[PDB]
Amino acid sequence: ETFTVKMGADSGLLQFEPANVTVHPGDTVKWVNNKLPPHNILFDDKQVPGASKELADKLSHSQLMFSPGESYEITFSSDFPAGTYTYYCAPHRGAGMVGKITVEG
Amino acid sequence: ETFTVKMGADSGLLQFEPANVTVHPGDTVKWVNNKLPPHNILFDDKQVPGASKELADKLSHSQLMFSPGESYEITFSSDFPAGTYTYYCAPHRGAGMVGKITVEG
Amino acid sequence: ETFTVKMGADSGLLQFEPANVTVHPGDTVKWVNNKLPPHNILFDDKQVPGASKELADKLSHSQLMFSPGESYEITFSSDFPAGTYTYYCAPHRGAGMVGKITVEG
Amino acid sequence: ETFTVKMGADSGLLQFEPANVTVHPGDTVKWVNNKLPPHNILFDDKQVPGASKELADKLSHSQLMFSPGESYEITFSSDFPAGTYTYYCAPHRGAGMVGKITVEG
Amino acid sequence: ETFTVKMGADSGLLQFEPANVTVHPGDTVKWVNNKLPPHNILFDDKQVPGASKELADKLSHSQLMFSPGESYEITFSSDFPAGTYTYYCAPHRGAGMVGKITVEG
Amino acid sequence: ETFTVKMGADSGLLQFEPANVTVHPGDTVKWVNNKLPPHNILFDDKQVPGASKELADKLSHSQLMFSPGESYEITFSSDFPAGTYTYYCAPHRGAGMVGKITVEG
Ligand SMILES: [Cu+2]
Ligand SMILES: [Cu+2]
Numbered sequence: 001e002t003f004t005v006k007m008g009a010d011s012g013l014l015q016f017e018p019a020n021v022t023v024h025p026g027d028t029v030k031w032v033n034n035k036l037p038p039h040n041i042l043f044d045d046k047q048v049p050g051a052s053k054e055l056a057d058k059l060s061h062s063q064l065m066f067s068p069g070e071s072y073e074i075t076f077s078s079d080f081p082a083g084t085y086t087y088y089c090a091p092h093r094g095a096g097m098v099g100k101i102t103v104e105g
Numbered sequence: 106e107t108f109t110v111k112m113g114a115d116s117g118l119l120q121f122e123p124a125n126v127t128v129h130p131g132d133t134v135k136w137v138n139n140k141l142p143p144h145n146i147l148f149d150d151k152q153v154p155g156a157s158k159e160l161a162d163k164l165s166h167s168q169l170m171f172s173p174g175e176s177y178e179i180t181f182s183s184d185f186p187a188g189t190y191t192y193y194c195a196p197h198r199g200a201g202m203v204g205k206i207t208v209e210g
Numbered sequence: 211e212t213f214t215v216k217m218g219a220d221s222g223l224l225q226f227e228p229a230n231v232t233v234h235p236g237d238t239v240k241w242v243n244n245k246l247p248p249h250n251i252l253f254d255d256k257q258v259p260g261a262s263k264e265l266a267d268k269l270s271h272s273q274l275m276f277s278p279g280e281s282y283e284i285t286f287s288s289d290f291p292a293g294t295y296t297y298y299c300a301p302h303r304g305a306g307m308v309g310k311i312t313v314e315g
Numbered sequence: 316e317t318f319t320v321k322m323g324a325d326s327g328l329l330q331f332e333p334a335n336v337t338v339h340p341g342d343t344v345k346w347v348n349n350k351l352p353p354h355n356i357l358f359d360d361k362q363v364p365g366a367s368k369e370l371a372d373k374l375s376h377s378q379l380m381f382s383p384g385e386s387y388e389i390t391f392s393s394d395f396p397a398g399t400y401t402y403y404c405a406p407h408r409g410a411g412m413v414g415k416i417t418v419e420g
Numbered sequence: 421e422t423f424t425v426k427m428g429a430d431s432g433l434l435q436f437e438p439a440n441v442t443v444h445p446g447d448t449v450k451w452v453n454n455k456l457p458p459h460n461i462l463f464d465d466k467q468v469p470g471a472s473k474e475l476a477d478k479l480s481h482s483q484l485m486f487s488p489g490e491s492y493e494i495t496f497s498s499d500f501p502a503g504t505y506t507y508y509c510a511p512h513r514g515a516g517m518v519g520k521i522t523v524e525g
Numbered sequence: 526e527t528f529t530v531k532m533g534a535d536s537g538l539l540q541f542e543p544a545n546v547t548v549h550p551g552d553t554v555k556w557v558n559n560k561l562p563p564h565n566i567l568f569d570d571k572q573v574p575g576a577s578k579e580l581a582d583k584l585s586h587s588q589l590m591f592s593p594g595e596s597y598e599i600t601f602s603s604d605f606p607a608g609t610y611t612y613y614c615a616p617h618r619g620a621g622m623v624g625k626i627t628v629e630g
């Protein structure tokens with residue numbers, strides 16, 4: 001499957017819609033730049049299963065996205081461990097623009 | 106913290122002593138060439154967490170060890186996924202010289 | 211697409227069926243252990259585009275496969291160069307168990 | 316061959332000189348910190364051949380360069396795909412400090 | 421064996437305490453967020469042994485740490501080359517918040 | 526520079542000619558298949574500077590070379606550490622077909 005997460009709610013709020021998402025092995029999470037750019041997706045080394053920095057760096061879209069429609073996908077294949085993945089938006093961190101992905105396995 | 110696994114039991118049996126070992130992140134597994142050489146440690150691409158061939162190749166000590174005392178260590182850091190790691194000895198595969206490492210996390 | 215290559219012909223010959231395969235970027239090549247095991251897939255450093263040893267080592271399934279059904283897949287994504295990839299089976303090299311994959315791009 | 320690209324024109328403009336460069340496999344691209352620092356080289360996941368994020372991250376010199384003369388080289392060997400590579404300078408993005416490398420092959 | 425480096429001296433100075441540390445293979449360096457956040461650890465491609473960008477990127481904790489107590493560890497295993505590793509804090513670079521790790525071997 | 530090492534002496538001896546070679550940073554070592562094949566170049570994890578298994582695996586030409594003229598080159602760039610690199614030929618190990626490369630720096 002493919003779960004779409006909008007960066008910036010329609011209401012004009014600095015949030016990820018949905019904030020919490022539960023994914024199964026093989027599913028894809030698609031982030032779409034919606035409202036109030038820029039945004040980026042950052043995963044901290046200790047916010048991913050096993051505290052793997054190597055894993056966090058691969059998932060983290062450090063670069064800022066400005067134009068609406070720009071997307072970033074992550075297919076959680078058999079390779080990725082099971083557990084919760086917490087991420088955030090650096091420019092809107094103070095606004096509490098935080099997200100969470102739970103991979104069940 | 107450092108678990109020692111002997112390649113070839115004192116009994117003269119073609120086995121890994123211990124055959125099964127449970128490790129925690131940060132711990133090291135030390136293989137020591139004991140009896141009836143040669144021996145090597147091979148991890149198949151599908152016998153490691155996530156079926157990562159890249160991971161299996163890094164852990165696999167393909168080359169044969171002949172002299173007693175020769176060791177090979179693997180510190181299971183945060184970069185290594187949790188799960189069971191099955192390995193074997195190529196020259197003594199038919200004798201059932203197989204091992205298993207379970208990393209909890 | 212996914213091209214299946216059988217390691218050991220149905221006729222009981224030590225060959226790869228098919229021996230020559232033409233793949234497009236994105237397409238996958240699946241090797242299935244069929245007849246007269248063991249078999250392995252080895253790519254020499256000079257038998258791959260650009261003579262990249264780093265590339266040859268990643269594609270090479272050095273370890274021997276014994277049980278029928280065991281598979282090994284390689285998805286030739288964008289990261290893989292265009293050109294011919296020649297591989298062979300080490301235990302059946304003298305029998306001329308050689309293969310060839312041509313990636314068009 | 317080695318193509319030199321100056322980060323910041325002699326005329327004092329926030330540009331890459333040259334902005335567009337055509338490279339052949341094997342040729343190198345050298346960025347030299349010239350005028351009005353800082354500068355960095357960023358490649359977006361979708362601005363490289365095949366939209367490979369793994370490839371973009373390896374080429375991207377995220378860290379800021381301040382002192383004149385500081386260089387960053389990239390030898391486009393066989394491992395690198397053919398196509399256009401668009402990059403930019405984060406601190407001078409609004410000024411349109413964008414570049415483009417076309418690898419023929 | 422585990423050397424602790426405080427990001428921000430108790431004195432309220434924007435420094436790494438200690439600034440210079442000598443480590444042996446197998447030892448771990450632990451950075452603890454102490455005073456005047458944020459802080460991050462950045463290693464430049466040319467400030468590590470062999471000028472390996474791949475190595476620098478793995479060690480660099482690009483993301484900003486705000487809460488006191490947050491830590492980042494690096495166990496200098498056999499895969500890491502011997503030599504000096506110079507790092508810095510991006511937000512406090514002008515204050516001269518620079519560090520240095522010397523791995524003996 | 527480029528130092529040529531012949532795998533199998535003209536005298537018909539199972540040796541590397543020369544057995545010992547001193548190389549400077551940037552020099553290339555070229556192994557040429559000469560007499561009494563097969564041969565391969567294997568570096569053990571503990572026979573290279575720093576006991577880096579990752580380094581040993583990259584230098585090791587595991588696969589057997591049969592036809593005369595087949596070569597294998599290794600350019601010891603700034604990346605490679607200084608020290609002695611001991612290697613051997615697996616099929617002719619008992620004959621004492623061992624070599625040694627000393628990189629001065
Ligand atoms: Cu945001
Ligand atoms: Cu054995």
Ligand SMILES: [Cu+2]
Pocket residue numbers: 224248249250299300301302307
């Ligand atoms: Cu075969």
Ligand SMILES: [Cu+2]
Pocket residue numbers: 329353354355404405406407412
């Ligand atoms: Cu700039």
Ligand SMILES: [Cu+2]
Pocket residue numbers: 434458459460509510511512517
């Ligand atoms: Cu700081």
Ligand SMILES: [Cu+2]
Pocket residue numbers: 539563564565614615616617622
């Ligand atoms: Cu030999």
Ligand SMILES: [Zn+2]
Pocket residue numbers: 044045046481483491492
């Ligand atoms: Zn962190």
Ligand SMILES: [Zn+2]
Pocket residue numbers: 149150151271273282
């Ligand atoms: Zn396999």
Ligand SMILES: [Zn+2]
Pocket residue numbers: 254255256586588596597
């Ligand atoms: Zn070769």
Ligand SMILES: [Zn+2]
Pocket residue numbers: 061063071072359360361
């Ligand atoms: Zn992107």
Ligand SMILES: [Zn+2]
Pocket residue numbers: 376378387464465466
């Ligand atoms: Zn740099």
Ligand SMILES: [Zn+2]
Pocket residue numbers: 166168176177569570571
């Ligand atoms: Zn060894």
